């Protein structure tokens, strides 16, 4: 009776964990299974993902106030200050649901399991530090300059992710080897600083210990290759050997050695991911069998017990009916153990359909339309005219570019876009009159084409509403959206399937890796804000300086301007210029910030990218 | 009698080919085995390697005459012209030995084998083209401007190499995939040229079709990251998304996709090298057995036939005596087939010894010296004082650097180098009085230390000959060679053995890969000479130009100046500057030269380097 239905709840949650690749380490109770099924719903996990985005969105609208139009410092309508109410209200509202998340994760798990698992403990210490810092900054009227609780926000992203925790373990195992090459590189520098200072001080680059040390470090990433050697090379031809050897040993051996060291841990990444997925499903159904085999009882599981459990699970109805027919094909025989486990190998099949088309009333009208629809040249007529559209934009952009930027003719340009757009409407209306409103939605390219067509006629008819033949801005907007038609010529990839297959495989696997970049940007922005917030003031310079070039838009005055400035240091070109400017404005101890940013971003993460491309390329063969 | 000894010659050359991993496809004759053993000697292969270096050295002393001190064009003592005699004499003397090489390679191989093997045919066509071009340039008095026979010289390097022929086959199999990503990248460019020209011409970078096409191509290799976007970024913050997406799709996906495509062919490089080595030794001894088993005869090979053949082979005497004792341990029994093949597994063992030390006459004198020699702290006392030497050079280079460059004290600097050098002499003289003149040579570090010590005392005593205490140049030369002592602290690599093991493994495997770089430089230099030989003349510039910077040393006027100029384009930094200069001086069709040089050098070869590091790292585990 009661233990009858109680075993049913242990049946349904063990099947559901066996599908979704979860573990079985939660305590089994009566209403906890009401909570377990509800906490893992679609609605609950999507609220938790939305609030994580919210606090990581919130730094755009904090007191540095990145709501302007230009980030340039020489002219900017600066202020938009929100008051002390709303931003600290939405800060504490997200802290409630994370506190609600921790409570139901610890209550549903073991209490002793809570004290052992390090991530739940770190989830707890971050919450109280964020709450103490909230009430302290609320006691004062917002006039605390630096907000330490803003740094702890990316731990909420790292907690609920299951792919970043794998990737952080792989870079933790690579760490004692990366410190050795980092040690060997620092030996390699300070040798050539001493060896350089004998040759050249006996150059504006070699006049001091920290100046020559900086000049070699920037050469190590090859940001000044010709410019650091041209005094010495103009004195003698033989001085080229000193700089050639330094970048061969430095940039070629030791930087590419860091890539091979990181890839040595990611070598079995996807295959060992699939193995622990299948291993968790093996003990999933086995514990489901073991509790169902001992419901009331030889050793077997009654199919009438199966009839109620496989209904209450949440699954695709394709695999659901296949389970249901296969147990109905079985008799009243008690199901064996090996036949129980191999029964759940229906979840490896995948079925792809699109839709069935629909007929008409009049028989010669329907048979002519559908048999010129099943043609394979109908889309090729669309592909031909779209290419004919694109060369027209091509020839007309280059013809008006060179001469007469003010007053161009643009007479035939209107008529060309008319005949193409009304061609685009008639084909998609003939498609839906040959497939159906359901028959047209089943293709993802047709959603892409059908949405793009109905937008362009709105743009065209609006130009046709005010002109007959804001002219230039509408034609520029109309020309821009015609260019996006070229993305529909792309997916006909017949001989180069190895490229499009991995690009899909890459973006399906950048939950972890895109997440790590977000963690690193968000930390280094807020550190960079509090150090260089008001350092650059713009009120006759050397010809290669920060001020001869107009690099004034690259500062750390807000969140949007920090991200682009950190981007331009990540692509390592011309970061000798930023090093000289931030020395001249904020003292020479700022170089430890940029060098540390150079090590995390360019060295570690862009090697981390190449290890993940290499793994996801070499897969299934 | 005659066929008795004739089988002995077929025995010895089949064993020798089985050792040195050669093939058996040469015709077996009487005096051809006299030629086969002599052509493959140590002296013959080393003459062929020296003449290959000679013609590839010869371009330094041709008519562009790269014998100056500076390559700067604004001042240079230009001319040194050798006459028409000697350079065309040494050109034709190397052509004789290559013609002698082709003849004995074809005569010893099959005649029909000659017409099938493509490399021997290409060896023949290159020889007659080089000889026709020699006699044509000799008929005229050297006044032919361009020498087409100079381009065919790297085929002589490619012919006699057995590792470059493997590597060229691996990049030939990768070619139809690299053309697809090259196709997909060209689609990716010309979309954003049209999309860029609508947004920004509606910037000095976006004013034309070939100007905007060049600006995106240089952004693709990130050579102008901040400088190409700062007008648009200073107009609006939202224009950063256009350039961020272009370098994420461009540089991160598609360039790193080219590395993964190349590495997909080098994935089994070293293991499939070892397999075809062992496979050639398997059929080597088997054909040696098969001719020896049918000398006069159950089925076996008489050991008295073995006694004469294993003497006449050339081998290490360590494995030679081990073969000889093992056949002497065998009786007069006819040796079986399986026991014949497993007999030659002595060639897998390797024995390392150094030397035995020698005693003295007087027993308390020898026993005290050798037992404080077997100490392991004797070298640690050398390691301590060498570190104490290096901090002295460290502290004294930084102290005199900042102030007073003219007249420094340098009083204690002499005395510091005295006590260290005479320490260095007494330790190596106590080492040879505890090891021996033979006992000291057996260590490669002691050869390195012993040579460095005897040089520094010559430098020190020469300063002591003219001073007592050209001063500064001698102390600068003395300080420089003390820095090289730090290379002896390095080889005590206890916890990071994975780094030093592969660095040895890399340089033992760059016969192929260093050879390909030589082929690519040598071709692209001589093409670049004949196009831009006298284009730059130096007789108030924009502040970032080729002439504001003093880049005048980077031209193509000779062979030494071409190599450094091609080097500074290989490391891709600031190659926007070279593109603008060579447009302004030699017309706009010069950009096809540098773009083609960008594709071969940076894209292919530096991806080729990272594939070879990755293979030689992941080896034996």
Swiss-Prot record, chains A, B:
Identify the stretch(es) annotated as Interaction with phosphatidylinositol 3,5-bisphosphate.
165-169
Q: Which tissue types show expression of this protein?
A: Widely expressed. Expressed at high level in liver and kidney.
Give GO BP annotations, semicolon-separated. Answer: calcium-mediated signaling; endocytosis involved in viral entry into host cell; endosome to lysosome transport of low-density lipoprotein particle; intracellular calcium ion homeostasis; intracellular pH reduction; lysosome organization; monoatomic ion transmembrane transport; negative regulation of developmental pigmentation
Q: Which residues lie within the membrane without crossing it?
A: 206-230, 556-578
Annotated phenotype, changing residue 165 to A: Strongly reduces binding with phosphatidylinositol 3,5-bisphosphate
> Which molecular function terms from Gene Ontology are attached?
calcium channel activity; identical protein binding; intracellularly phosphatidylinositol-3,5-bisphosphate-gated monatomic cation channel activity; ligand-gated sodium channel activity; NAADP-sensitive calcium-release channel activity; phosphatidylinositol-3,5-bisphosphate binding; protein kinase binding; voltage-gated calcium channel activity
- Impact of altering residue 216 to P? No effect on lysosomal location. Loss of NAADP-sensitive calcium-release channel activity. Inhibits Ebola virus infection
Name the gene. TPCN2
Domain remark text? Each of the two internal repeats contains five hydrophobic transmembrane segments (S1, S2, S3, S5, S6) and one positively charged transmembrane segment (S4). S4 segments probably represent the voltage-sensor and are characterized by a series of positively charged amino acids at every third position.
Q: What is this protein called?
A: Two pore channel protein 2
What main location does UniProt list?
A: membrane
**Subcellular location field:** Late endosome membrane; Lysosome membrane; Melanosome membrane
Membrane topology per record: Multi-pass membrane protein
Question: Which effect does the record note for changing residue 273 to A?
Answer: Reduces binding with phosphatidylinositol 3,5-bisphosphate
Q: Which reaction does it catalyse?
A: Na(+)(in) = Na(+)(out); Ca(2+)(in) = Ca(2+)(out)
Side Extracellular, residues:
68-89, 139-145, 231-240, 404-409, 533-555, 579-593
One of its Pfam families is: Ion_trans
Coiled-coil segments on the chain, per record:
none
């Amino acid at each position: 009776a009661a233990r009858w239905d109680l075993c049913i709840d242990q049946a349904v949650v063990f099947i559901e964990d066996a599908i979704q690749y979860r573990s079985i380490n939660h305590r089994v109770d009566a209403s906890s299974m009401w909570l377990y099924r509800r906490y893992y719903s679609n609605v609950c996990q999507r609220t938790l993902s939305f609030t994580i985005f919210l606090i990581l969105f919130l730094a755009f609208i904090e007191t540095p106030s990145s709501l302007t139009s230009t980030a340039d410092v020489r002219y900017r309508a600066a202020p938009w200050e929100p008051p002390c109410g709303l931003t600290e209200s939405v800060e504490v509202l997200c802290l409630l649901v994370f506190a609600a998340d921790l409570s139901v994760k610890g209550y549903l798990f073991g209490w002793a399991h809570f004290q052992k698992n390090l991530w739940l403990l770190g989830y707890l210490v971050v919450l109280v530090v964020s709450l103490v810092d909230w009430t302290v900054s609320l006691s004062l009227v917002c006039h605390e300059p630096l907000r330490i609780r803003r740094l702890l926000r990316p731990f909420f992203l790292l907690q609920n992710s299951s792919m970043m925790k794998k990737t952080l373990k792989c870079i933790r195992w690579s760490l004692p080897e990366m410190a050795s090459v980092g040690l060997l590189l620092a030996i390699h520098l300070c040798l050539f600083t001493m060896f350089g200072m004998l040759l050249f001080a006996g150059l504006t680059y070699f006049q001091n210990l920290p100046e020559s040390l900086t000049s070699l470090l920037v050469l190590l990433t090859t940001a000044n290759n010709p410019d650091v050697m041209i005094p010495a090379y103009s004195k003698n031809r033989a001085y080229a050997i000193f700089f050639i050897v330094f970048t061969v040993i430095g940039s070629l051996f030791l930087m590419n050695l860091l890539t091979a060291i990181i890839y040595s841990q990611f070598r079995g990444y996807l295959m060992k991911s699939l193995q622990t997925s299948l291993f968790r499903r093996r003990l999933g159904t086995r514990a489901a069998f073991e509790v169902l085999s001992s419901m009331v009882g030889a050793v077997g599981v009654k199919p009438q017990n199966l009839l109620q459990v496989l209904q209450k699970v949440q699954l695709d109805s394709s695999h659901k009916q296949a389970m249901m027919e296969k147990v109905r094909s079985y008799g009243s025989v008690l199901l064996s153990a090996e036949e129980f486990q191999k029964l759940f190998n229906e979840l490896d099949r995948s079925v792809v359909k699109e839709h069935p088309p629909r007929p008409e009333y009049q028989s010669p009208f329907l048979q002519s339309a559908q048999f010129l629809f099943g043609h394979y040249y109908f889309d090729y007529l669309g592909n031909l005219i779209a290419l004919a559209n694109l060369v027209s934009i091509c020839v007309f952009l280059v013809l008006d570019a060179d001469v007469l930027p003010a007053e161009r003719d643009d007479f035939i340009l209107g008529i060309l876009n008319c005949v193409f757009i009304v061609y685009y409407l008639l084909e998609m209306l003939l498609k839906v009159f040959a497939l159906g409103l359901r028959g047209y939605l089943s293709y993802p390219s047709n959603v892409f084409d059908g949405l793009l067509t109905v937008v362009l006629l709105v743009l065209e008819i609006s130009t046709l509403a005010v002109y007959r033949l804001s002219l230039w801005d509408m034609t520029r907007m109309l020309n821009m959206l015609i260019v996006f038609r070229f993305l529909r010529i792309i997916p006909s990839m017949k001989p180069m399937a190895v490229v499009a297959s991995t690009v899909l495989g890459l973006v399906q696997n950048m939950r972890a890796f895109g997440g790590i970049l977000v963690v690193v940007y968000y930390v280094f922005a807020i550190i960079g804000i509090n150090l260089f917030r008001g350092v650059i003031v713009a009120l006759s310079a050397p010809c290669g300086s920060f001020e001869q070039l107009e690099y004034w838009a690259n500062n750390f005055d807000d969140f949007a301007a920090a991200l682009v400035t950190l981007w331009n240091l990540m692509v390592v070109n011309n970061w000798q210029v930023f090093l000289d400017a931030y020395r001249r404005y904020s003292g020479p101890w700022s170089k430890i910030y940029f060098v540390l940013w150079w090590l995390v971003s360019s060295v570690i993460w862009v090697n981390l990218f190449l290890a993940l491309i290499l793994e996801n390329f070499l897969h299934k063969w």
